[PDB]
Symmetry: C3
Subunit: 100 residues, 3 copies
């Protein structure tokens, strides 16, 4: 599974490894795959507009080589949204997550 994240947050001088560690373990647990086979692509400093302003926001897509369930989708959106919120102060209300 590949989690591709695009956000307007600037990661200059930010240690993103605490995030990668938590997200990769969390996604791996949710989808039921080994943590080493979760690819994370994190692209910051991309201009975003949402809600009529440029507050911290993110768009993410996850591509899983296999079907999933409604509950797995709910858990992914909730968990990734929380981890993004906890680490980068992207509020879940400004997080759009396509689950492919």
């Amino acid at each position: 599974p590949c989690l591709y994240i695009t956000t307007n947050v600037n990661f200059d001088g930010v240690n993103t490894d605490p995030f990668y560690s938590e997200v990769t373990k969390a996604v791996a647990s949710i989808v039921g795959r080994p943590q080493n086979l979760v690819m994370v692509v994190l692209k910051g400093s991309v201009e975003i507009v949402f809600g009529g302003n440029k507050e911290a926001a993110a768009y993410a897509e996850i591509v899983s080589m296999g079907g999933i369930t409604k509950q797995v989708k709910r858990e992914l959106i909730a968990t990734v949204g929380s981890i993004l919120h906890t680490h980068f102060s992207i509020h879940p209300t400004r997080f759009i997550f396509k689950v492919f």
Copy 2:
């Protein structure tokens, strides 16, 4: 709905707010959603090759949380392509738009 745009145009020192204002109102009107719930992700300065050259070009994807129609797809491609053309001189012949 999230409109994710990737282009080789350089937005250094460019006021993109006139574009965000027109595109968000236009997309909102076409898909029938409030303008504040249209996310726009605009990533410039990405190398693109098309038609054998590197002239101004763009790839875009729109993710709508609901079905649409053939006419809505036509209107989105025509309208977004025009707004990109008008504001950033990306010619619609060099605009590839995936409507998810």
Copy 3:
């Protein structure tokens, strides 16, 4: 067809035209379209984590305006993965390729 490539490889001071030339001809031959109608979007210097490390890696998506076959998908993954390997030393084991 549009081939959108995201990688952690840094293309500063790299001539990417040898790559564009080979990939566009190879994709065009595989999918059966003129080489001038293959768009390539190559975005480097994007942080990626896979296999628990940040070695050279890439995520790619190809959007074809028409159906394809299992064999065409196999040929695209094998061929693009090889060209990325040959030119940018991205090993195919660290190449995730979504064929839409």
